[PDB]
Amino acid sequence: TEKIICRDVARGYENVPIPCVNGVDGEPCPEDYKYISENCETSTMNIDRNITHLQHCTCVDDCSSSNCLCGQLSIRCWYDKDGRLLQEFNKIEPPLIFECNQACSCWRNCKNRVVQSGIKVRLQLYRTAKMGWGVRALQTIPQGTFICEYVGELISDAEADVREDDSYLFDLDNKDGEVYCIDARYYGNISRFINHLCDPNIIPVRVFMLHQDLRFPRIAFFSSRDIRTGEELGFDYGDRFWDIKSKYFTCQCGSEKCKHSAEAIALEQSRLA
Amino acid sequence: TEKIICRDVARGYENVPIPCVNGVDGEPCPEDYKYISENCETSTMNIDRNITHLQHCTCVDDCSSSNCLCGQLSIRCWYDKDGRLLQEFNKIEPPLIFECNQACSCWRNCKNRVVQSGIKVRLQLYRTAKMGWGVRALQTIPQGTFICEYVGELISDAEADVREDDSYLFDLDEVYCIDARYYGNISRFINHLCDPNIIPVRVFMLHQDLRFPRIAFFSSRDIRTGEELGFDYGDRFWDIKSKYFTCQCGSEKCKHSAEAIALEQSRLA
């Protein structure tokens, strides 16, 4: 039987509480980590926070025009009037998003500040059947809605390379130079509990807000389709993760489209010869 | 004969709107600065944002216990149940206040997060009689209430020493400064009073880089509606600006007026 174990795993560090339940086994509100709502550093990253380096807009409306420079650096501004991704949004090739910032002319409440406004939808940390902890929606979520940000600790590839647990890494794809990661292992928000789905229902988008240091995009998940209450959430972890993790365990998403089940895995070894 | 010029000079960045009114002359909503709710940088200040260098507490309560480490770092926690300073607060030389942080065990709603929770009282930017713009209250403000932070651009004393205008400099105790000239919030418009109803306090929140305390204003006594806010700018400012102009605070205790500046000029010779 199900029961509210933690009333709010975010200790009210979010716009809404995110409670945790377990109706599958006897594991408690996990506490092998620290909840944070915003990214953190351990080493010196020296994010460029130079207010003059900020590409801003001069809009004096609600930034709903196409003349918003902030909403040009991403071709179009990709948010509708209700702060959803355009139905025509490039869901496979997600461009960089530059939200309005503190150098802009617009008001804090313009139409180009979705991600920076924090979680809005009601989420729940819950015990899955076969994947441990997972996240699910306690409400329908229209396609294109912002769910939550992938928050954790900022580290270099050289740091990631030598960390015991690689279970909670997230790659920040940068065109040039050195590469960086978010490790949600020791520090993280709700999103650290999102599982991999072979048939995903959210997508990550690299976003820029209070700063535009291309080394460190913030990662925001939006719903790639309508989501029915109670439905588990999950993005595609991609092959990097699976190539490493397969020999240790097997996908359990269950989707017939499953590309990483013990069955589909062995089918390709069988297809080999 | 008073007009409302900006609905909110903070462009909706504060918890509340801060409107501007002019009942004196024909000067409009000031617009030769950028309004920001949080301190900004131009050049790198290399603040220490390392979460492990954060001294945290491990309370499970609302941090009311005398056992909250954060509280102790400040001698004790100086906030009452409603977030106001204690009547027994050192108003002359106030201690640094370490608020709870993101590494603390406590909840975001604990008793030790006043300043980080933003402006609560209703303020208004208005045109004074002889002091240009000023900030006044729209409500009574109980003593020890948190008002606003002095927000601006962090600069070294080397940088400050060669800034054209030194009118929006606020000093921290390596020397660094907040210059609210090109970037600032409502506090950039608080005038100087010889009878100051607010005091600065150095605070730490998301980080504990001691070079960079954030500056919070609290009422030093009760404040009636309409009453103008103002803090003693200190003698550094006046020993510079005296020869340029003189204090118009209007106080009977005023110590920088034309009268006073001449009274001590001759009270000597």
Ligand SMILES: C[S@@+](CC[C@H](N)C(=O)[O-])C[C@H]1O[C@@H](n2cnc3c(N)ncnc32)[C@H](O)[C@@H]1O
């Ligand atoms: C970032 S964590 C997600 C939260 C995790 N379920 C937990 O309870 O901590 C990812 C780890 O959860 C498990 N996991 C996530 N998605 C899975 C999936 N689709 N199938 C099987 N295990 C999965 C694996 O142990 C994986 O290394």
Ligand SMILES: C[S@@+](CC[C@H](N)C(=O)[O-])C[C@H]1O[C@@H](n2cnc3c(N)ncnc32)[C@H](O)[C@@H]1O
């Ligand atoms: C930090 S600004 C205060 C905002 C200023 N009233 C304005 O209109 O922008 C400080 C400047 O305001 C004026 N000022 C502030 N306090 C004053 C006082 N007590 N008497 C006269 N002028 C004052 C002087 O021009 C001073 O250099």
Ligand SMILES: CNc1cc(C)nc(Nc2ccc(OC)c(C3=CCNCCC3)c2)n1
């Ligand atoms: C270990 N060193 C590095 C270095 C870099 C640049 N990226 C990564 N990324 C990485 C590696 C392994 C992973 O799983 C085994 C993952 C993922 C972890 C779970 N979160 C979803 C993304 C895949 C990411 N790791």
Ligand SMILES: CNc1cc(C)nc(Nc2ccc(OC)c(C3=CCNCCC3)c2)n1
């Ligand atoms: C110009 N260079 C420097 C360097 C340093 C370390 N401090 C300062 N502080 C300073 C100088 C002049 C001031 O007024 C003329 C002020 C003040 C400005 C207005 N705000 C009230 C505090 C006094 C501060 N200035």
Ligand SMILES: [Zn+2]
């Ligand atoms: Zn705009």
Ligand SMILES: [Zn+2]
């Ligand atoms: Zn903008």
Ligand SMILES: [Zn+2]
């Ligand atoms: Zn905008």
Ligand SMILES: [Zn+2]
């Ligand atoms: Zn699968």
Ligand SMILES: [Zn+2]
């Ligand atoms: Zn505490």
Ligand SMILES: [Zn+2]
């Ligand atoms: Zn604390």
Ligand SMILES: [Zn+2]
């Ligand atoms: Zn606390």
Ligand SMILES: [Zn+2]
């Ligand atoms: Zn005076």
